[PDB]
């Protein structure tokens, strides 16, 4: 009764699909995370070496 395992190697269950999805899902959630952080991220300017670096005023 050993050709049930043998038969798994030819069925890929829905499980593959959630496990093909899922590891996705978690890199969706950390991109969404720096997308809200983003914002915060623009509450200081380049104050890098020296400024001006500009034409208007």
Do not use: C, W
């Not at 959630?18 to 995370?33: A, E």
């Not at 997308?35 to 208007?56: A, C, M, N, V, W």
């Amino acid at each position: 009764m050993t050709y049930f395992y043998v038969t798994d190697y030819l069925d890929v269950p829905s499980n593959i699909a959630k496990i093909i999805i899922g590891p996705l899902i978690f890199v969706f959630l950390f991109s969404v995370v720096i997308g809200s952080i983003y914002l915060f991220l623009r509450k200081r300017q380049p104050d890098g070496p020296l400024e001006h670096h500009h034409h208007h005023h």
